[PDB]
Design an enzyme around this catalytic site. Sequence first.
Site, PDB file in Angstrom:
ATOM      1  N   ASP B  90       0.873  -1.165   0.000  1.00 57.26           N
ATOM      2  CA  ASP B  90       0.000   0.000   0.000  1.00 57.26           C
ATOM      3  C   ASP B  90       0.912   1.217   0.000  1.00 57.26           C
ATOM      4  OD1 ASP B  90      -1.735   2.075   0.402  1.00 57.26           O
ATOM      5  OD2 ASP B  90      -2.696   1.240   2.198  1.00 57.26           O
ATOM      6  N   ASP B 125      -2.457   7.548  -4.644  1.00 53.20           N
ATOM      7  CA  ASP B 125      -3.818   7.968  -4.973  1.00 53.20           C
ATOM      8  C   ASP B 125      -4.457   8.492  -3.680  1.00 53.20           C
ATOM      9  OD1 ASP B 125      -5.571   5.612  -3.691  1.00 53.20           O
ATOM     10  OD2 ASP B 125      -3.877   4.671  -4.723  1.00 53.20           O
ATOM     11  N   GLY B 191     -11.739   4.369  -1.486  1.00 50.14           N
ATOM     12  CA  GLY B 191     -12.710   5.219  -0.822  1.00 50.14           C
ATOM     13  C   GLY B 191     -13.936   4.486  -0.306  1.00 50.14           C
ATOM     14  N   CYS B 274     -18.890 -22.445  14.575  1.00 48.09           N
ATOM     15  CA  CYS B 274     -17.790 -22.726  13.655  1.00 48.09           C
ATOM     16  C   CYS B 274     -17.101 -24.046  14.009  1.00 48.09           C
ATOM     17  CB  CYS B 274     -16.783 -21.567  13.748  1.00 48.09           C
ATOM     18  SG  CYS B 274     -15.318 -21.688  12.700  1.00 48.09           S
ATOM     19  N   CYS B 276     -13.662 -24.590  12.868  1.00 45.39           N
ATOM     20  CA  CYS B 276     -12.242 -24.415  12.574  1.00 45.39           C
ATOM     21  C   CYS B 276     -11.314 -24.930  13.688  1.00 45.39           C
ATOM     22  CB  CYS B 276     -11.936 -22.941  12.293  1.00 45.39           C
ATOM     23  SG  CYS B 276     -11.660 -21.944  13.758  1.00 45.39           S
TER      24      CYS B 276
HETATM   25 ZN    ZN Z   1     -13.646 -20.765  14.218  1.00 45.33          ZN
END
Ligand code: ZN
EC number: 2.4.2.48
Lengths: 577, 577
Positions: B90, B125, B191, B274, B276
């Site tokens: 960036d 920019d 933006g 979840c 994970c």
């Molecule tokens: Zn998770």
Amino acid sequence: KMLKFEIKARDGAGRIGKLEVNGKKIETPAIMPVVNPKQMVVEPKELEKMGFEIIITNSYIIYKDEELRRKALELGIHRMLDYNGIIEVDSGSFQLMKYGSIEVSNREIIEFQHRIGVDIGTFLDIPTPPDAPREQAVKELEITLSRAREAEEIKEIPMNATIQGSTYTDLRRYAARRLSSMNFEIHPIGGVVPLLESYRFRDVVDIVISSKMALRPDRPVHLFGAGHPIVFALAVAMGVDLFDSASYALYAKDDRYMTPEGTKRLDELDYFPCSCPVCSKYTPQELREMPKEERTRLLALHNLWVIKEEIKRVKQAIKEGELWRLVDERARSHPKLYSAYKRLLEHYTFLEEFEPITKKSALFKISNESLRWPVVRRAKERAKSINERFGELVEHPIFGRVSRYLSLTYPFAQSEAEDDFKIEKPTKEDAIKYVMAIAEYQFGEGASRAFDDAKVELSKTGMPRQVKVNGKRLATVRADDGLLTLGIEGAKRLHRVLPYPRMRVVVNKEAEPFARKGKDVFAKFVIFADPGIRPYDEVLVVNENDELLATGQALLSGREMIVFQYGRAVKVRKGVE
Amino acid sequence: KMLKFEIKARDGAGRIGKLEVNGKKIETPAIMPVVNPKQMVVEPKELEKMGFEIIITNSYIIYKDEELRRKALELGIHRMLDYNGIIEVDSGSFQLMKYGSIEVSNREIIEFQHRIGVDIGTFLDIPTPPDAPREQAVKELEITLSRAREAEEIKEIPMNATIQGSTYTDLRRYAARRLSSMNFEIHPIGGVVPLLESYRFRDVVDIVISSKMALRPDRPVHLFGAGHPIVFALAVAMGVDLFDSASYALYAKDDRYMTPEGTKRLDELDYFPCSCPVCSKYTPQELREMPKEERTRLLALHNLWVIKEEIKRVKQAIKEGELWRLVDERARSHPKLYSAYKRLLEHYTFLEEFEPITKKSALFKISNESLRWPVVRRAKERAKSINERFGELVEHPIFGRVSRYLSLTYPFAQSEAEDDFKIEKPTKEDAIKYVMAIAEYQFGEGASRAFDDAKVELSKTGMPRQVKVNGKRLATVRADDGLLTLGIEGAKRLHRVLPYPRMRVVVNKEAEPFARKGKDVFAKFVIFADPGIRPYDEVLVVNENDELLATGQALLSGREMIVFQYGRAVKVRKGVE
Ligand SMILES: [Zn+2]
Ligand SMILES: [Mg+2]
Ligand SMILES: [Mg+2]
Ligand SMILES: [Zn+2]
């Protein structure tokens, strides 16, 4: 009383409950993995390790098999399966639908269930298939009811009493009514297996709701055979507490992969839209090439994780009061589910009785259907008399127009749609007007008389808070929902202003002293209660002479407080003493 | 030649692409974690192991820190961060938004990026805020463009050319047209951070589409700062290929938990919805018990897993041709997203240009919004003339009423809603009648004249198949979509029946020979193509003199065939030679 069941949280007609079976406690909604004694894809020991504290097996398969039967009798099903959670048993009733017959008497299988030490048994209920000749559905049901009476007299363990009216609504109500008057602890809803596989969800909704309307609210409900995640949210929203699944293993054996939105073939998968122990390490193109036994094993585990995750997702949505939003989300999985979802919303009368008066989450306008959610229709109908008396209406993103006096109250202020709704703060002259409209809205007609001459305090923000009158506080407007939290003095005023039995919860003489002390009220001591009370309403705890004992918040509907014999009826804020 | 980009699969304006830079290849949609040189909750090494093969960092922050700077110019960012993937940076202009000014010239940071071995750089920019005065949006945009002019001349590395016109659609259009004409490799849309955080998704949709309408379709599109999974499906359905996330870590530091539907606070979570590596081994309360540092790390990983999972879910949906269904499911996550989803569907013209002509997936009605999906609007518009000519109308759940002659064709046939759709099979006197409706439907007005004196043979069943004339194969109705697969002979008649440029793809003189033999047509040899062409249409390969060279099926829309310089444009069925 070997089986206890109490509500811990709720949203819609669903609930998170605490179920206890002879010392073994589990939290519902729960799902029980089906285990094949002959060929176990996943060991009961591993299922228990994964968190499944309740499983189910076919007592008939075990009974008809020498090795199994013998081991079961020798060690008991627990040691045989090496599992310590709750073990429920199926009576091979599936072979009674698949093969039309079964080689064992009602009394025999029941006795066998006791001998092997089952936690929850069943009797030979006949699963009349969908769209059966009415004559058949009736005949089979009478046989089911007759076998149910025998089981009732002979049982020595908690037992399921399945509702079985095929696709005839009147039969479901009949069966449900008869079984509810008998003493069984759980009511499974049968004959839906073929409907679920056919994705005829709308037919399942009508059979389930027809059953729930005639069943005692205080017993767990089991959607027999519902083992796919796609239906969890919808089913729990209707009041289903238990599920069972053989699909996790059977799908795995046919190389099928479960998702909360449906099912995929392993060969149609390029990516695993999942992060579970299986999907977080392997890929579809890998699995597809592994040994059958390994592929089956991993797919089954994945299926179990998705199942476990959906249930946790449903329970978390209930906790925050967004089950309807999840249901709406899931309804987009398939047209048939969408259809079922719309049908469910038609049963407003049923759903409204259990829909909490307030929720932690804001009301979300995320579809055309959300405009038909119970909370919306209830709010609209209730605000009518208010808008008419107080006028000064204002535009609302969801309700169109609502008096400014209800603009800070749930679900008017606590809602969000495409466009933002501007909160209408009070003037020092308006203040009391807000409290009066809220009282009328929350407590019903005439309730404003209890606050007519009160003084309303405004916070740093122009928000109404403490409501006082010649002395102390009568109530306080909650910051989170704009509804009134009653003070004891406020409960006194509503008590004289509103006629018995309005807002009343009448308790035993035994419980009377406790209520006076501010202790909570348990449902078993509630002899009567106002039918209009809804979960989370402010309520007046009273004795038979209608003498005020305390004020609190309801956890159950008025009707539920009467039937339930376990759990808390009211969370008491203050006792008269 | 520094950056290569080819579409591998697509659905809606969305696509799965192959992006290659510096020999390194990556599949998109892709998300790049934002790594802070001064603070790394998760190390890039670990990110690379989790499969994140592309990241982004702030060059300014590096450039302005002695140590970091030294190491940067010393080992290069790749070795400095111990990351061997694609590293984007960036320009640091993100401080030019939060502070309004930085101490470094456009030219300086650009040369500094070249020096540290960055794979993808950026110029300075200006991220004009959402609702800025037009004068400001215009001023900053021209400064931005002048800086782009300098970058284009000094550039020795692949670079991002960010579209930046605040909330003015015409400015976005102008910005996109200008940068699109300059030689840059990727176009981020800037933006939008403040909009995403404020959940102003509808405004993001209008900004994204205005930008996309005026950008060269062959360049990747990066939705700058869109790091929350909640917008992935929606953004990808608009043609966004890249995302970047700082949120996964920033939310974690504030005990925030990401979900595909939104964000939860750890203190407000009773269950982890979840499966994970984190949520699979710990419970919410166990997470709270941990020290802030460990807690943050685990929350960060969870957030990364949900992000990775949603991306796989989006790609798997594109692959099965069900992106719109997933988008519809996700729009129920929040009122604002639902709003943005409805706004996106109003941009029919843009969406319709990239919507494939046929799909493997059936058309499902799962909401009122689905009735407005591109494929529905299109088939409805194209049918009007066919219905008002062939009559023989039938009932259809989604389209209401359509000619039975189109009943066998996508999206009519496979269509499915609450009620199924009964397809009418052809008779002996309708065989040719169906082919003519389809051709007028597939190839447009007048196309039927190419199939008048033709014969249509019905398969074993009663389905129209291979069409012929005096023993010559004109076309063949497919079995999977009911569309015509043109024969080199049918193409010849279509060529003369339909006026140039209808159905034409004009190739090079260098590609003309290869075409005649029947070799596939590659994009870089196509100089012009009918704008009316949609992905998977039947196309007439021709040279500049409109001489038929072959027939085939398009992989891209006509517009795309022209601008793309990589990949196949036409899958040649047969050449004229
Ligand atoms: Zn998770
Ligand atoms: Mg009671
Ligand atoms: Mg080209
Ligand atoms: Zn998985």
